[PDB]
């Protein structure tokens, strides 16, 4: 569908006439940041922004893809390098390892530096490299970790631990000779490593012992809890710090937040990843956008201010799935909450950092008419006179053969939330890709996030915007 | 391989304090741009560019990812959306009007507003939109197009044409009805539309008769001339002209390019397309990055400044057949000639932008290890357990059924410049995709490009930039 007012070339030029004006009254802050946010959108490249973007539109009113997304209002973007130092297509460990830590690692591993090896214990000690979240604690800060992933998940586990091997997440999951050596569990080292005020995701199983009932699936054994070391790590979190309280639903969430002397909170919403938002039990779970407003709501009363990260984690689990459906409802929601913590922090004070730790084989093509369903059929059949989707993959578990060649789709199909995008070639899991991803970025210091940088860029931007880590002599004036 | 430099912190540590110093070292101008540059890659999407990147750095002596390419090394960045206004997935003529005139356009139209409607030549009247380049030969500057296409390609055409059909290249092209009711085509236009001081790309045989033997290949007589009109449109360019000379090689266009007194040069290397740059015969015919060369000898005379217009417009065509070898190859070419014109012009005078019309559905993926070649095959077996490719397409015609199956891959096929990557869907050509490509910037300014932004901007920031177009009461000092 043409757009009538589109026809119009003074549309255009008004539009950019206004773009202009907009980019000549961007000025640099000579301030520091006193809040940190970083919102990871895990798997989140250029693609699913795009097809991401087009979706909300049309669930707004609109055509698709003239409608901004929130972090598309970001001022600042620049394009991020992810290579992981020993793989061109990196994991979500090392990525984040690069943008929490600011130094590149190897695949697999979290908070090492690439002199550790993947799943060797031993090579472990003097390789710990401290993340800018770490940091800010360090300097009097509050610090929260909000996911739809577990806690103990790659990407959060960056902002506080340092292992080997990030499919370490209980102790059960520790070979012998890893345990005897010290590396801890992510569980453990979740409340062990440092402070945090704010912890809110999934991930209830691995902090209680075997035998251990879950509270919202108190009948399905497979959810309880997985330790073999007898620890309640709740119960011995909730020991080490006065005004903590745990919650796993979202109606204790929701009084927690609200509840002054409530100072540390740890919500597990689910025994592992929470459900995708389109599953969400909207009565007995938080969504992200809930999730970081509660945790801002908690981070928000430090008067030396807050380190916030944020992950729309399952964004990359859709794409694994091949299911671009579940990415990009999750993109959406994660977009959601970008724009909920915009709405509750100050621009003035707050660096504000969205970006994606690596993206996916994921690609948005045929030649679709404006205003057409992003899950909809390219027009025109293919060289086999079957219908193709105009969202497709390179790999993963969409490649079908249905007696011997490549199925037809029709719009009802290709439009299922369950529908898998077909791909080259069959995987069980549709891979990452290499390519560069975003970094938008707005508040104090937020002029500095610009070009082609290496990913690591990220966490040394945000430790100099609030004169952390090894920034300490910033030469910024206290913030705004 | 794991590179032992970068098993130290201090590496990435040195690495971002130095590109924190040279963040905070960008200052916006506040002079104008006396010369304006775009390099166009058409195609030339963010994977395209990581994967460029990487094969790059290893032509070099380098693992690849690490190694910047020239385009890297420009300070400012934005995401530029490339809707036309009909399709979400565009055309190289609709985007061509956005970043070249600024102004959204229907798919395969080209210089022309959306009221226009594709191959409906009595649309065309009224919704002609001019070119920043034809803006800045109205304020006296010197002028270029330089392309490894035809130089009446969708692309180059943006620069000077207004048509209904970006297929209308000679008169042998368009209907009677269109011809009668006055639609010139677009080698016509090339010569009639406005004084262009340098075209430099293929196209020789729009330009000619039908009988007219083609000089380099006088016993093809599909390479001679195509129109139907009796017109030698060179020689009727060359007689409106004096310093005009037209060339068809290497050697002529160099001797042309030294020659004080040529002040117009039309160089037509090719009766169409020019060769693959892997395929270039390097006696007969300028690569982009000597052309782009050619270009500057005679653009930089004028005192005014210049705009030229420079084309990897074979990446594309490398993306369409599913050989990434030959999108890649195009893209390090394209990138030399960035390079080069860098050499040979200050970014105190000069806005150079580098973007892409719009992008392909290529992906990098599997999980290849540091250092190994981007045409190579990603480790460990398929579902099917057969081998797969780092390299990707979503469609296009390598998708292959040997005997009703996937075919394993091995490296030496893999590598070939002639390899095909496989894809989900099979078309006789990779459709192009839809997300945001970048937009790369330095010079006078360059900080303006910012965000995410219409592609439209790229034209506005450019007629802005050097007070032209409807900015010429920009609030700018003279270029320095
Ligand atoms: C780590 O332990 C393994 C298994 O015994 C051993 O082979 C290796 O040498 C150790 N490396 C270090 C750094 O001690
Ligand atoms: C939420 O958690 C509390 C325990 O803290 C429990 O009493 C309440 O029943 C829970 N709500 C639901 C709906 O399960
Ligand atoms: C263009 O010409 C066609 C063919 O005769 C006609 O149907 C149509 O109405 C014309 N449109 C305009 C704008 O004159
Ligand atoms: C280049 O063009 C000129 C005509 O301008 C011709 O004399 C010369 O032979 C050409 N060179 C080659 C190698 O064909
Ligand atoms: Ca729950
Ligand atoms: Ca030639
Ligand atoms: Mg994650
Ligand atoms: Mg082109
Ligand atoms: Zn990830
Ligand atoms: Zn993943
Ligand atoms: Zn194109
Ligand atoms: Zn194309």
């Known amino acids: 569908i043409i757009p009538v007012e589109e026809e119009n070339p003074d549309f255009w030029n008004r539009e950019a006439a206004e773009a202009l004006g907009a980019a000549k009254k961007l000025q640099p802050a000579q301030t520091a940041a006193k809040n940190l946010i970083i919102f990871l959108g895990d798997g989140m490249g250029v693609s699913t922004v795009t097809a991401a973007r087009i ?149 209830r199983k691995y902090m209680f012992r075997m035998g251990t009932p879950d509270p919202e699936y108190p009948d399905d054994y497979s959810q309880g809890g997985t330790r073999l070391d007898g620890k309640n790590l709740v119960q011995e979190w909730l020991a080490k710090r006065q005004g903590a309280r745990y919650v796993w639903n979202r109606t204790e969430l929701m009084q927690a937040s609200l509840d002054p002397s409530v100072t540390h909170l740890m919500g597990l919403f689910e025994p592992g990843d929470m459900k995708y938002e389109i599953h969400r039990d909207s009565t007995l779970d938080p969504s992200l956008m809930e999730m970081t407003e509660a945790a801002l709501r908690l981070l928000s009363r430090n008067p030396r201010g807050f380190f916030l990260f944020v992950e729309g984690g399952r964004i ?35 660096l504000s950092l969205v970006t994606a730790d690596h993206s996916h084989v994921f690609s948005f093509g045929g030649y679709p008419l404006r205003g057409s369903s992003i899950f909809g059929l390219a027009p025109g059949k293919a060289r086999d006179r079957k219908a193709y989707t105009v969202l497709l993959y390179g790999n993963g578990p969409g490649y079908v053969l249905k007696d011997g060649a490549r199925p037809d789709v029709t719009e009802s199909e ?67």
């Not at 794409?319 to 915009?342: K, N, P, Q, V």
Request: hydrophobic residues 35%; aromatic residues 6%.
């Open 414 to 480: 290709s439009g299922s939330p369950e529908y898998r995008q077909q791909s080259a070639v069959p995987l069980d899991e549709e891979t990452h890709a290499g390519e560069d991803v975003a970094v938008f970025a707005r508040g104090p210091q937020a002029h500095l996030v610009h070009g082609v940088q290496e990913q690591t860029f990220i966490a040394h931007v945000m430790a100099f915007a609030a004169c952390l880590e090894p920034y300490t002599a910033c030469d910024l004036a206290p913030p705004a």
């Open 316 to 350: 990359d689990h859709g794409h694994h799935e091949s299911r671009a459906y579940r990415a990009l409802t999750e993109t959406i929601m994660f977009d959601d909450a970008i724009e909920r913590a915009g709405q509750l922090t100050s621009e003035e004070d707050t």
């Open 55 to 203: 979706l909300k539109g049309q669930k707004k009113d609109k055509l698709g893809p003239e409608i901004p997304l929130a972090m598309d209002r970001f001022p600042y973007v620049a394009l991020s390098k992810t290579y992981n130092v020993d793989k061109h297509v990196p994991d979500s460990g090392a990525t984040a390892t690069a943008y929490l830590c600011g130094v590149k690692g190897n695949f697999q591993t979290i908070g090492l530096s690439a002199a550790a090896r993947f799943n060797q214990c031993n090579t472990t000690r003097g390789n710990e490299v401290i993340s800018v979240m770490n940091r800010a604690k360090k300097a009097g800060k509050s610090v929260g970790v909000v996911t739809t992933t577990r806690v103990q998940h790659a990407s959060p586990a960056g902002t506080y631990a340092h292992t080997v091997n990030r499919n370490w997440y209980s102790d059960a999951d520790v070979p012998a000779s890893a345990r005897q050596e010290g590396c801890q569990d992510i569980a453990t080292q979740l409340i062990s490593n440092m402070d945090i005020d704010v912890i809110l995701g999934g991930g």
